[PDB]
Design a protein around this ligand. Structure first.
Ligand SMILES: Cc1cc2nc3c(=O)[nH]c(=O)nc-3n(C[C@H](O)[C@H](O)[C@H](O)COP(=O)(O)OP(=O)(O)OC[C@H]3O[C@@H](n4cnc5c(N)ncnc54)[C@H](O)[C@@H]3O)c2cc1C
Ligand SMILES: Cc1cc2nc3c(=O)[nH]c(=O)nc-3n(C[C@H](O)[C@H](O)[C@H](O)COP(=O)(O)OP(=O)(O)OC[C@H]3O[C@@H](n4cnc5c(N)ncnc54)[C@H](O)[C@@H]3O)c2cc1C
Ligand SMILES: Nc1ccnc2ccc(Cl)cc12
Ligand SMILES: Nc1ccnc2ccc(Cl)cc12
Lengths: 432, 431
């Protein structure tokens, strides 16, 4: 189309959530999603979890999993309208222009240019470009043999290619100790403890989830990964990567050497901010991504949501969050504000990890932490105020955590706050 | 004190007035309310350190009129405003000023403010134009009341009247600060002192006046023009302590020197008035200070910020906060248009000038950047080989050319060719 009322750049989780929100408030809305990915909008968490533990031998083809069985696609293709039928169809709809990249953003003229030369004008635009997986400098300096045997896990194709590799090679090494590195380690370890193959995980931190959880909970997570058969090598920094006798040779800075067949690099995300140049949009030098206000707005007719959005939290300060529920929350918020809602980010996004624990706010191990265990609650503190909470094996209490974050009180005794999560007897308080 | 008003402007200074005139130009029936904590109607401040000191009329402290063409410091006569009680009723709307009232609470979700007297006003569109408060020295704050009562923070009409009275009563006045305000008060007090036989001292940490703005060469030239007015300029001076000794103020500098004086004028920078950010949940910029706003001067859906208090995004030059008169006019006007749906980004650069017997300036005029002066002369402020700031030294009617240079963003290969655009055809200086 040459003109569309609502334009969403990027065909991921934030864009879809915004599409459903625009349609929910403007039942006749005409929303066009422009996605460089050839696949329709889909969720990513199953690509490192449920899709690996399915009994169906056609999961790599069906892309279905159990929760209740469902697909990773947000809705079936029949629910979308054609991009050619979007400006004419009665009652509007949602169309997805797959295989097309917005390469230019003209803010003053409310216009975008696609990679094929097409030009589309909009009335209201959302940037939901997500991010690209970061690579290691050591791997970039290496040759094609190393780069071609290194996987950057993000898309459906990465799940299929890596799932295929796990059935062909004897050893796979995961670099990175965050969520993605840990979840792929457990997934490959289970598949490896049956076929007799090897799975290695190495990262610079002292333990898995070191940059998120306190030292004690980080060590416990590392032990749960080791119980799945994974060889976890903490305190590991990569110096070089090369090929030796057809095998990948990773020489660590501390001297150790790891021989493996394939590498999975899960070492963080880089926001996709290419459109900031042509659009004259500000990017945040501290957190990265597009700088937007509390309402996820960049300019009069441009919002930003998802991994790419650096927004202002009225209670916690400027942030950029890179997880699924936040893309849904911020995507929905942008869609409402694109229909005049003028709402600030207020309902905090959360995340969880079945090992299980829930989490909300500024979960950063660099902050002072106070863990209260009986099951436990970990308070992340800044200026004597609770800015982050982790509920360790405590369920149906996230609303309580939302109130604490929202109140912003300087509590005099966090053991009393623990009572709000039913933590009373045999209290073991930990500090870090 | 209306309970509801379409356009609410917080602060009654230069940015607020410019926005009111801009809102009225685009919405001929607009009803604009200015809430000002100062008891005076909107007025311009530059004359308080310049023309009002060099007036032959001995009643300038009462009339507040000066020659440039004679004019008042007030932006318009009081009759052009409408009463706050008649604002929601007057035909074709108008602009009302609620003087003597401070907005002490901002409720963004409810589009409501609370004044210091308990009054509550709801708005449809709001502009924050609170300006800033003069910074003080820690040495003066650590001192006692005897010192604090003999220290002047120059900004408002009352400060001009109070200091003008002091200049006629005391024998020695010390100015702390080498910026515009400190330098202009030095020349103004120096002329008054060369007639009464009094003393004027100016001390600052920089190597010369305007050290943080102009390159070393133009800074030293400015220091010589101030010294020629009778002022004792003491550069490289940092204040360690201030006390009273035999009824006289004793300023001990960190390097050992001691200055005895009767009164102090502290012009050591400005602190943006961002008190309303707490209750309003508004972001402030930790790097530049002030309210953080985007290229359109917008903070939230119905809230803009202009003037000295606004930290905005320049599409060409990056994030900035500018503290001068023309910028309050430019950003105030821009906010007024965007409050009437313009959606325009800051694009037309604000400028400033200084008559030194003069020069014009535009962009990032910061001496910490590399400079290339071509001398009449033009000084280019460079960043990544791109011209981000220009100072036209005794070159007039060429600011449009300077505006285009800033707008182009070229990485010029020879600034001597760009100098020809200002009719400079040769002493090239570097810093
Ligand atoms: C394997 C995996 C597992 C995860 N598991 C979890 C989990 O368990 N829990 C959790 O909370 N989070 C998880 N996450 C994170 C979560 O998936 C992300 O937060 C979420 O996908 C971000 O949504 P998004 O819309 O911001 O971006 P994306 O999903 O990356 O979508 C952006 C889309 O826009 C496209 N695009 C970019 N630039 C352009 C352009 N110029 N023109 C057109 N299209 C463009 C990109 O190609 C991409 O297709 C996981 C992520 C991965 C990769
Ligand atoms: C003595 C002097 C000389 C100057 N000379 C020059 C010059 O020659 N050239 C130049 O370019 N610039 C000059 N400047 C700078 C220029 O005057 C300022 O940049 C300009 O005043 C900024 O306008 P403003 O509206 O942003 O703020 P202000 O003029 O400070 O106006 C803000 C007003 O809002 C009021 N206010 C604050 N908070 C509240 C509240 N909560 N409720 C109600 N009211 C509130 C403040 O009291 C103040 O009255 C000079 C400044 C001074 C002080
Ligand atoms: N379980 C997760 C919670 C929060 N953020 C994540 C980011 C990436 C991956 Cl793979 C998993 C998570
Ligand atoms: N000439 C000036 C230019 C820019 N900013 C100023 C601030 C205060 C004073 Cl007194 C003068 C100026």
């Amino acid at each position: 189309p040459s003109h569309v009322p609502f334009l969403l750049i990027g065909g991921g989780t934030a864009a879809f959530a915004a599409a459903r929100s625009i349609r929910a408030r403007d039942p006749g809305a005409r929303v066009l999603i422009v996605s460089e990915d050839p696949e329709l909008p889909y969720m990513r968490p199953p690509l490192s979890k449920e899709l690996w533990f399915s009994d169906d031998p056609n999961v790599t083809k069906t892309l279905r999993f159990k929760q209740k069985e469902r697909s990773i696609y947000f809705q079936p293709p029949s629910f979308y309208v054609s991009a050619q039928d979007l400006p004419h169809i009665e009652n509007g709809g949602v169309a997805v222009l797959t295989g097309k990249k917005v390469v230019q953003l003209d803010v003053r003229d409310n216009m975008v240019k696609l990679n094929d030369g097409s030009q589309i004008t909009y009335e209201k635009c959302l940037i939901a470009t997500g991010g690209t997986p970061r690579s290691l400098s050591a791997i970039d300096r290496a040759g094609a043999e190393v780069k071609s045997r290194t996987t950057l896990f993000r898309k459906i194709g990465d799940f299929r290619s890596l799932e295929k590799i796990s059935r062909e090679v004897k050893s796979i090494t995961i670099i990175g100790g965050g969520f993605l590195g840990s979840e792929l380690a457990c997934a490959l370890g289970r598949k490896a403890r049956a076929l007799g193959t090897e799975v290695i995980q190495l990262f610079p931190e002292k333990g898995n989830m070191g940059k998120i959880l306190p030292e004690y909970l980080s060590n416990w997570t590392m032990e749960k990964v080791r119980r799945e058969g994974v060889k976890v090598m903490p305190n590991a920094i990569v110096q070089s990567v090369g090929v030796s006798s057809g095998k990948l040779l990773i020489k660590l800075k501390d001297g150790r050497k790891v021989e493996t067949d394939h590498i999975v690099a899960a070492v963080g995300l880089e926001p996709n901010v290419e459109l900031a140049k042509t659009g004259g949009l500000e990017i945040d030098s501290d957190f990265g991504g597009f700088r937007v206000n509390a309402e996820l707005q960049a300019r009069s007719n441009i919002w930003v949501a998802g991994d790419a959005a650096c927004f202002y939290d009225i209670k916690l300060g400027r942030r950029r969050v890179e997880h699924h529920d936040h893309a849904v929350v911020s995507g929905r918020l942008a869609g409402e504000n694109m229909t005049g809602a003028a709402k600030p980010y207020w309902h905090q996004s959360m995340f969880w990890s079945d090992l299980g624990y829930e989490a909300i706010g500024l979960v950063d191990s660099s902050l002072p932490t106070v863990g209260v265990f009986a099951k436990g609650v970990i308070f992340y503190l800044r200026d004597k105020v609770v800015v982050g909470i982790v509920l360790w094996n405590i369920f149906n209490r996230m609303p309580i955590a939302r109130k604490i974050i929202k109140d912003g009180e300087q509590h005099e005794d966090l053991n009393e706050v623990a009572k709000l999560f039913n933590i009373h007897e045999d209290l073991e308080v930990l500090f870090q």
